[PDB]
């Protein structure tokens, strides 16, 4: 048997449709970008909860994630990342 495997490939392809509607993706490229988000997710979350443990505070929260991303990303990308995280969570909380 073979269990259903987690993937973000549909979302990756959709955002590529938004960017370049005429462009497709190779299978190897799609596996590569599917691995991108999981690798980033891990190296953000571990650092964020380690920072939370340094705070000796129970909850991993938005401030912890913001700090973790701005720690680990190179600064030029970090500015964009924190701005987009903040505006996204604000748009959500405005619901």
């Amino acid at each position: 048997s073979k269990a259903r495997k987690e993937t973000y490939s549909s979302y990756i392809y959709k955002v590529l449709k938004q960017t370049h509607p005429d462009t497709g993706i190779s299978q190897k490229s799609m596996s590569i970008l599917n691995s991108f988000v999981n690798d980033i997710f891990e190296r953000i979350a571990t650092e964020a909860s380690k920072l939370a443990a340094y705070n000796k505070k129970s909850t991993i929260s938005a401030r912890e994630i913001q700090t973790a991303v701005r720690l680990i990303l190179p600064g030029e990308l970090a500015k964009h990342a924190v701005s987009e995280g903040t505006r996204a969570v604000t748009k959500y909380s405005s619901s």
Binding site: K28, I32, S35, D39
Partner: protein, 79 residues
């Protein structure tokens, strides 16, 4: 036994990719030495991973895992 299969013209081609245009001999045998070291280290790591999984097919999961353990994350094949 088959480390010689990684042969002097082959490592010459590797060095063309490297950007050299002059190469002496003994470079060659010690390139085999470093390749031996890399292969055995990562192989040991993947082997330990699978045998702790009480499997006997060292698997790409365990290889990309051993590579991340070695500090270099080969990237594209899940992981």
């Amino acid at each position: 036994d088959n480390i010689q299969g990684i042969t002097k013209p082959a490592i010459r081609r590797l060095a063309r990719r490297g950007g050299v245009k002059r190469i002496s001999g003994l470079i060659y045998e010690e390139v085999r030495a470093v390749l031996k070291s890399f292969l055995e280290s990562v192989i040991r790591d993947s082997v330990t991973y699978t045998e702790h999984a009480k499997r006997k097919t060292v698997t790409s999961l365990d290889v990309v895992y051993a590579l991340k353990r070695q500090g270099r994350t080969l990237y594209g094949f899940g992981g």
